[PDB]
Design a protein around this motif. Structure first.
Motif, PDB file in Angstrom:
ATOM      1  N   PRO A  11       0.747  -0.936  -0.177  1.00 41.90           N
ATOM      2  CA  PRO A  11      -0.069   0.099   0.284  1.00 41.90           C
ATOM      3  C   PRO A  11       0.797   1.530   0.441  1.00 41.90           C
ATOM      4  O   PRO A  11       2.176   1.132   0.995  1.00 41.90           O
ATOM      5  N   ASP A  80      -2.482  -8.790  -2.123  1.00 42.13           N
ATOM      6  CA  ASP A  80      -3.569  -7.507  -1.293  1.00 42.13           C
ATOM      7  C   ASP A  80      -3.344  -7.675  -0.407  1.00 42.13           C
ATOM      8  O   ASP A  80      -4.182  -8.487   0.942  1.00 42.13           O
ATOM      9  N   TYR A  81      -3.080  -6.298   0.837  1.00 37.61           N
ATOM     10  CA  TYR A  81      -2.787  -6.310   2.420  1.00 37.61           C
ATOM     11  C   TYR A  81      -4.059  -5.972   3.049  1.00 37.61           C
ATOM     12  O   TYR A  81      -4.017  -6.290   3.956  1.00 37.61           O
ATOM     13  N   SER A  82      -5.244  -6.028   1.844  1.00 41.29           N
ATOM     14  CA  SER A  82      -6.748  -6.206   3.326  1.00 41.29           C
ATOM     15  C   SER A  82      -6.622  -7.160   3.770  1.00 41.29           C
ATOM     16  O   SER A  82      -7.851  -7.059   4.525  1.00 41.29           O
ATOM     17  N   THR A  87      -4.675  -1.298   4.978  1.00 43.34           N
ATOM     18  CA  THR A  87      -5.476  -0.223   3.853  1.00 43.34           C
ATOM     19  C   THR A  87      -5.089   1.247   3.665  1.00 43.34           C
ATOM     20  O   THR A  87      -4.816   1.803   5.548  1.00 43.34           O
ATOM     21  N   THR A  88      -4.579   1.444   3.334  1.00 40.04           N
ATOM     22  CA  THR A  88      -4.646   2.960   2.662  1.00 40.04           C
ATOM     23  C   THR A  88      -5.051   3.635   2.260  1.00 40.04           C
ATOM     24  O   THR A  88      -6.110   3.702   1.849  1.00 40.04           O
ATOM     25  N   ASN A  89      -5.398   5.161   2.667  1.00 42.49           N
ATOM     26  CA  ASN A  89      -6.251   5.896   1.831  1.00 42.49           C
ATOM     27  C   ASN A  89      -5.822   7.538   1.501  1.00 42.49           C
ATOM     28  O   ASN A  89      -5.906   7.650   2.877  1.00 42.49           O
ATOM     29  N   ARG A  94      -5.129   2.344   8.491  1.00 42.77           N
ATOM     30  CA  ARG A  94      -6.085   2.107   8.687  1.00 42.77           C
ATOM     31  C   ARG A  94      -5.667   0.197   8.740  1.00 42.77           C
ATOM     32  O   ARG A  94      -4.946  -0.691   8.464  1.00 42.77           O
ATOM     33  N   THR A 385      -6.953   3.822  13.287  1.00 43.36           N
ATOM     34  CA  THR A 385      -6.473   4.389  11.645  1.00 43.36           C
ATOM     35  C   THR A 385      -5.575   5.740  12.202  1.00 43.36           C
ATOM     36  O   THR A 385      -5.994   6.338  12.924  1.00 43.36           O
TER      37      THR A 385
END
Ligand SMILES: *[C@@H]1O[C@H](CO)[C@@H](O)[C@H](O)[C@H]1NC(C)=O
Ligand SMILES: *[C@@H]1O[C@H](CO)[C@@H](O)[C@H](O)[C@H]1NC(C)=O
Length: 402
Positions: A11, A80-82, A87-89, A94, A385
């Motif tokens: 990510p 897929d790190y989720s 996750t990142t955004n 997060r 987060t």
């Protein structure tokens, strides 16, 4: 262990570098899961099974020696790190402790530089580190952590560890735990993985703890026997800073009754203040919420020096014996000056319920309340987060409303 064929998809996370004259300028970083959280299996032809459990040397059928382990154990990329709760955004990271599928990935990640092949090395003595946080989904017994470990910049990339930092190799901390790989090499002799550790943030919605942990070593040290134990080379306890431990009970918690109201997001500022010889002397924590600076509390307890910052006098007086013996604040600062890797994690404690963080002297959580078996009734999906990671000049990372 040897990298496998599966793609590693890190990510992307935008962070900032800050100065008084220039403000906060965005930078590109990447996130990597710990190496031993990647799938690890045996090479083709060697059958089923992994290459060892936390706490132990790797199995000697595949890992009789480092060279064999390096060819016989395969570490797969994560596409897929989720699937691991990461996750990142934008500028946000997060970390989900528990997923809806019922898995408990409890992720631990590190910050990579923009090349993905070297950790972002932070040199914080004389500087400040700041982040924004949402702690609402962290009940008693949860630990959201954001901290520094004196890991090697490439994850100790080497012939037998060709993956390096790109795969999250090289973890160590002040607990000197035994892992089946250390520095990406099979840990044949079952040594512990020790290094200086600055716990910027260990917290939930109920308590906030800061603690430097010294070791008498530079970088990662492989310990044996009593060296890994309480009287050994690292400070397991740390010099802890928690308003509750110094008899200030209205500073931090869930609701308007608290100065830092953990029902709402807030900013966390940590300054590493040096003396005129350039050695670390004080660690200063304050917050920003609703556009206003929230200064540190002062201590309020019999037998505790009156202070609003961590320093040697406070650490000594509060019983931080190994902290002082293994280098004290100056020693912690020398590690910070050499350079540290940023680790972020979310975890819980089956054995001890995280009582040191938020129970008894340390906070409002009752006996049993922080047990994992209770956490899931209170918050089925704990998560944290972290947003707008930023570091640089003292006084430059935050801005009050005008
Ligand atoms: C990302 O974060 C923003 C702000 O909190 C949010 O509104 C959006 O719904 C989230 N997801 C994106 C950008 O995938
Ligand atoms: C806490 O602080 C108050 C002073 O604000 C003092 O009267 C009291 O004895 C202290 N309590 C403890 C448990 O240290």
């Amino acid at each position: 262990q040897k990298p496998g064929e599966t793609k590693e998809v890190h990510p992307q996370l935008t962070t900032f570098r800050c100065t008084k004259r220039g403000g906060c300028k965005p930078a590109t970083n990447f996130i990597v899961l710990d190496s031993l959280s990647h799938p690890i299996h045996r090479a083709e032809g060697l059958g089923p099974g992994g290459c060892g459990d936390w706490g132990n040397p790797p199995p000697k059928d595949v890992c009789p020696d480092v060279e064999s382990c390096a060819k016989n154990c395969i570490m797969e990329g994560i596409p897929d790190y989720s699937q691991y709760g990461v996750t990142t955004n934008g500028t946000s990271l997060r970390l989900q402790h528990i997923l809806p599928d019922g898995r408990v990935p409890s992720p631990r990640v590190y910050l990579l530089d923009k090349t993905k092949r070297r950790y972002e090395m932070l040199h914080l003595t004389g500087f400040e580190f700041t982040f924004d946080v949402d702690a609402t989904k962290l009940p008693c017994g949860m630990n959201s952590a954001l901290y520094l470990s004196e890991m090697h910049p490439t994850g100790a990339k080497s012939k037998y560890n060709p993956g390096g930092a790109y795969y999250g190799t090289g973890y160590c901390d002040a607990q000197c735990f035994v892992t089946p790989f250390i520095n990406g090499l099979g840990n044949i002799e079952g040594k512990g993985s020790c290094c200086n550790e600055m716990d910027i943030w260990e917290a939930n919605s109920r308590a906030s703890h800061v603690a430097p942990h010294t070791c008498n070593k530079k970088g990662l040290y492989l310990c044996e026997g009593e060296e890994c134990a309480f009287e050994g080379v690292c400070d397991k306890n740390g010099c802890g800073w928690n308003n509750y431990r110094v008899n200030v009970t209205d500073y931090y918690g869930r609701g308007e009754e608290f100065k830092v109201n953990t029902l709402k997001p807030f900013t966390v500022v940590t300054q590493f203040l040096a003396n005129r010889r350039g050695k670390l002397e004080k660690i200063h924590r304050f917050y920003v919420q609703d556009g206003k600076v929230i200064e540190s509390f002062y201590t309020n307890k019999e037998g505790v020096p009156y202070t609003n910052m961590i320093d040697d006098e406070f650490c000594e007086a509060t019983g931080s014996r190994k902290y002082m013996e293994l280098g004290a604040t100056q020693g912690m600062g020398e590690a910070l000056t050499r350079g540290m890797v940023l680790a972020m994690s979310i975890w819980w404690d089956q054995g001890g319920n995280m009582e040191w963080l938020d129970h008894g002297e340390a906070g409002p959580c009752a006996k049993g309340e922080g047990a994992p078996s209770n956490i899931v009734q209170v918050e089925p999906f704990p998560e944290v987060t972290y947003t707008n990671l930023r570091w640089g000049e003292i006084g430059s990372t935050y801005q009050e409303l005008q």
